[PDB]
Design a protein around this ligand. Structure first.
Ligand code: FAD
Ligand code: FAD
Ligand code: 1MM
Ligand code: 1MM
Ligand code: PYD
Ligand code: PYD
Ligand code: K
Ligand code: K
Ligand code: MG
Ligand code: MG
Lengths: 582, 596
């Protein structure tokens, strides 16, 4: 090819973005990356979103990718610019989010001299990228860009980093540049044999446009109840009777009980992380027993060999794209008419273990769980497409439990790394991906404080995001652990919040606040109906634990369920131990 | 052996080690993996705990605290995102040699390598930006690792170190005695070698005719640094120039002061360096923002060296920075201050240097820090604000500490402020981290409760970490935040104006209402736009008790000059010229379609 000859490395970058079908780029300029910013000045090949902090660009790109299905592209400078995107990269690495991060670097002749704004970005990002590299020459630039996008979007999607020395991007190109089938059958037999099967679905099913469809097909065909992980929410319609909801540490008791009593667990695009399995040795006993008798066990539809048999020994492993392999064994699955025995047990659990919690009473404070339920309906009553992002903590768990998920790619949350401050920037990026959607960020006060500077970025990008802050004036998830395992010793978990409404107004947004239950319903209406970016602060009760809960050495079936009397005794104890402070 | 810790948890042992290491302040943010340690320091009276809204804030606060106190900054954050959030501050401290010990919680040892919840390979991530790091494998070695961390961070060239703390290690109870040495916090040939290099250095200095002391941060790493630097300067009549990180080490009120050298340094300083026959480098690393085109650096010193009558003497503590950028004739290893003390008696007292000084005074009159001053109806000039604030702050009689963001405002603060006291300028130089200003100011205020702490910030820099505004309120640190608002990434637009034909690619951001932001955060907000209101607002600013933010609307697209860039030598600098600034303005309006 000789179409690039005569162009600078930066101009080649501009063209390559076009070839990769990039329509949006998130970044912050800086000295080392100036040659690239000059070549993309007023570019019409893609839109550009400017944050206030590189961490924002990073999280914005993640939200964008998770909502659009396309890799998020980041463009920052060297030194601090690159170190500032490490968290987003580690975050995208843990959740398998496709992201291509371009970092400006000092001239190749300055590298290794402790140069101005120089960092060993390739070394620093090594553990949090599927692959990274430093471009040495302009003739090598197109190849590295093409490899970066390919790697980031194949296998298990993930982040990649391309280091761009200033002299390389300023340089002008002169010279023209140049068994599974067996596993599928063995897996189908086991399924046809299962008496109490359960579908354990994860983020993997959402990595293919036809994932949700085939999942439903297999579920309806063989009548198999489906439970999903935090990252799997949205892949299955929770309206369907076969829905077990979310499993794990803070999952539905029914979901966890089903998994513990199942003779066959079909793992689809899930990695059995420690937030799901509970005590690994106590995980899926019935499945282990069934496997011992050659009448069940665990089937794993995983794309990455290294996640196979990593946490728990499986009986059958189907390597490759889950959606693809499911479509292949569909014809090898005997249609199941009914499962009265299995379904009877599950329905009994449902009625027995619902998402119970201390509901409001005359004069009491608004309850966080209630806000989620109400907001879920109101948002749905708009008919608009809905995408929800969140921060990290109790509010995140409650948003997961009390919202009714039915559409894929509508829940964007930080799971593996659990990065506080993810909500706002991720929502902004998601809004850019789906301009027509009603993007809502269900945030916590502590999380919000982390990246609240991006509020002005929302206004500058023209993203009418709705920011909901469940303010319990505490780092709730940590405080819950201190209450439960640390004799109510709240060590540095209560920060001083700024006036959120005045903050919103200062940032150029509309601010709303709710204190009384009598105003919640109306405020929620106005919130979702407001045109443009808006922030709604809802004062919710404090020291409210997320239940059920499976922690420590407890098995998924040994969960701590809600009990009104226990909460009351806990409140009295908390008061006595904190001197009536909490 | 030592059995005094038997029965204690790792967290409790940690708490105990802090007081043994003389730690009076800890900056941190709690999280799951680090809970055992947080439970152990709950209500501890061994030290004041400072809580930010973001771990990056904790890191920068710790740096500002260290730079102002001379003590290592201690950070305590959780695993995963908590640790990755402090990578910038560590890389920042690594670049500027700031002593800091970062403690990051970690998942249980049995969960490491399983892609556990909130797990990150922090020792791998931080290896290139710490002097040393380690992951404590058992509670038995916790005291050992803590002592090694503080020792390493505070010796040689100070820097950051990271200690990874697995949750099971900190929650574990020590059930085995441990070596007493691990719990408790020279060569005759080398000394004679150093003295020999000192005698060689003295000999070279005694024959110099046009000497120049090039002083950096190293001189401030010792309490007697400034004093000895002054004694040597007076004894041998040697003019003194400092790097950005050396500002405050030499009284700029002294006639022998040359001010700052480098890319944006005083022309006199740069000219003195280009014509000196001897350059006595004291605690400076010849970085690329100082030397200009290296092959054009100190030509007269290179010539004197070739003739065996001069060259470069380097007082450096780290072997890594000896003969790294330029060939030096005599390297004096070790603490600069200490070595200057040993060398003093070998220095011949000098009556005077008429010719040398006359030449320098000639350059001073010809090349002052000139710029376009205000005119009727024009916006306030950033340089003018600095000069006015400098005098208002100095006249208070209080001890003043200045922190900054990164950019033009940073350079103008360095040039136009009158530096006289050590450890009063706290700025990010090597890595140049925008957003450093506020958190660093809070940290410095904590270190020096009686000091008037001022953060001279840029609008873009301030936006990076403005969430720490509420932290200042919660911490009780009455920091004075000054925002020189030009509504642009000034330092970048300056480069775009000079080398990219005024093409401002994504360097203009939409700012929030700073005064309303300040008040929303819980502090007093002030704004000034008119020239005649500047004096009164600055007075109100520094006189306000409590944290306060003052936004000053300043002119836009104003370049920082002098400027040495590209392949230019320190003497081939661009100087301020009113006609040129006018022509540039005209060219800019046309090229940007009147937008800028
Ligand atoms: C406060 C907090 C509480 C939490 N509580 C819970 C909880 O109670 N319950 C819970 O479920 N989670 C919880 N989590 C989230 C949790 O940490 C994990 O992030 C999440 O469970 C991982 O879900 P996943 O396995 O589905 O997705 P991932 O972690 O992304 O793993 C996906 C798996 O699918 C594979 N795969 C990917 N793409 C494909 C493809 N195309 N074809 C085939 N296979 C593919 C991957 O390589 C991998 O093995 C919590 C997190 C936080 C922050
Ligand atoms: C926008 C921008 C513009 C800049 N412009 C300029 C400019 O024009 N001029 C300028 O000077 N800088 C400028 N800088 C800062 C610059 O990048 C360097 O950070 C600074 O010059 C380094 O100064 P230093 O060498 O004194 O300190 P350091 O970088 O900290 O280096 C100190 C040196 O002293 C040694 N040393 C340390 N302790 C001791 C001891 N006890 N005894 C003996 N030796 C010791 C070290 O190990 C090292 O080699 C700029 C930065 C930015 C962000
Ligand atoms: C970023 O540094 C490098 O990449 C870098 C690092 C070491 C040597 C030379 C460079 S450079 O000569 O090619 N570019 C450069 O110096 N750029 C730059 N951009 C801005 C906007 N401000 C300032 O300096 C105040 N410098
Ligand atoms: C941080 O993770 C680990 O260190 C971690 C990682 C993998 C396995 C086990 C742990 S743990 O069992 O020892 N602690 C733990 O899980 N803590 C914790 N703390 C809070 C405040 N919230 C939540 O979970 C929602 N978990
Ligand atoms: C943190 C940060 N982002 C961008 C630039 C240019 C800088 N100096 N620092
Ligand atoms: C960024 C960040 N800091 C602290 C905790 C606990 C978290 N989940 N994320
Ligand atoms: K639900
Ligand atoms: K000065
Ligand atoms: Mg909260
Ligand atoms: Mg500015």
């Amino acid at each position: 090819d000789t179409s690039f000859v005569g162009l600078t490395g930066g101009q080649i970058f501009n063209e390559m973005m076009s070839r990769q079908n990039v329509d949006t780029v998130f970044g912050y300029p800086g000295g080392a990356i100036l040659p690239v910013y000059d070549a993309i000045h007023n570019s019409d090949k893609f839109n550009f979103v400017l944050p206030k902090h590189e961490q924002g660009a990073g999280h914005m790109a993640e939200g964008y990718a998770r909502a659009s299905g396309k890799p998020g592209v980041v463009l920052v400078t060297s030194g601090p610019g690159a170190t500032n995107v490490v968290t987003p990269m580690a975050d995208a690495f843990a959740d398998g989010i496709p992201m291509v991060v371009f970092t400006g670097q000092v001239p190749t002749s300055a590298i290794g001299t402790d140069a101005f704004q120089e960092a060993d970005v390739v070394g620093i990002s090594r553990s949090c990228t599927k692959w990274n590299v430093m471009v040495k020459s302009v003739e090598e630039l197109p190849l590295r860009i093409n490899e970066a996008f390919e790697i980031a979007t194949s296998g298990r999607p993930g982040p990649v980093l391309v280091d761009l020395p200033k002299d390389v991007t300023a340089a002008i190109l002169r010279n023209p540049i140049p068994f599974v089938m067996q596993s599928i059958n063995k897996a189908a037999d086991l399924i046809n044999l299962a008496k109490k099967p359960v579908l354990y679905v994860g983020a993997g099913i959402l990595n293919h446009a036809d994932g949700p469809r085939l999942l439903k097909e297999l579920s309806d065909r063989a009548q198999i109840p489906v439970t999903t992980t935090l990252q799997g929410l949205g892949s299955f319609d929770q309206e369907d009777p076969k829905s077990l909801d979310m499993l794990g540490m803070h999952g539905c008791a029914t979901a966890n009980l089903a998994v513990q009593n199942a003779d066959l667990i079909i793992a689809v695009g899930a990695r059995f992380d420690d937030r799901v399995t509970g005590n690994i040795s106590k995980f899926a006993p019935e499945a282990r027993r069934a496997a011992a008798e050659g009448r069940g066990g665990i089937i794993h539809f995983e794309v990455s060999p290294k996640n196979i048999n990593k946490v728990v020994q499986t009986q059958i492993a189907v390597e490759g794209d889950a959606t693809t392999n499911l479509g292949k064994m569909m014809s090898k699955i005997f249609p199941v008419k009914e499962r009265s025995e299995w379904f009877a047990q599950i329905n009994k659990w449902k009625k027995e273990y619902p998402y119970a919690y201390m509901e409001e009473t005359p004069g009491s404070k608004i309850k966080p769980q209630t806000v989620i339920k109400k907001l879920s309906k109101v948002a749905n009553d708009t008919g608009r497409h809905v995408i929800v992002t969140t921060g990290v903590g109790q509010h995140q768990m409650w948003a997961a439990q009390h919202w009714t998920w039915r559409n894929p790619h509508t829940f964007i949350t930080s799971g593996g790394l659990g990065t506080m401050g993810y909500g706002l920037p991720a929502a902004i990026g998601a809004q850019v991906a789906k301009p027509e959607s009603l993007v809502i960020d269900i945030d916590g006060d502590a999380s919000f404080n982390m990246t609240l500077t991006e509020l002005s970025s929302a206004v500058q990008a023209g993203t009418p995001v709705k920011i909901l802050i469940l303010n319990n004036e505490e780092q709730g998830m940590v405080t819950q652990w201190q209450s439960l395992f640390y004799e109510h010793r709240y060590s540095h978990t209560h920060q001083l919040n700024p006036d959120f409404i005045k903050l919103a107004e200062a940032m150029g947004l509309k601010g709303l606040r709710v204190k009384k239950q009598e105003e919640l319903d109306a405020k929620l209406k106005e919130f979702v109906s407001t045109k443009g970016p808006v922030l709604l602060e809802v004062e919710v009760d404090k020291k409210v634990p997320v239940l059920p809960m499976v922690a420590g050495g407890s098995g998924l079936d040994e969960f701590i369920n809600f009990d009104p009397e226990v909460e009351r005794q806990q409140t009295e104890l908390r008061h006595k131990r904190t001197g009536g402070k909490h």
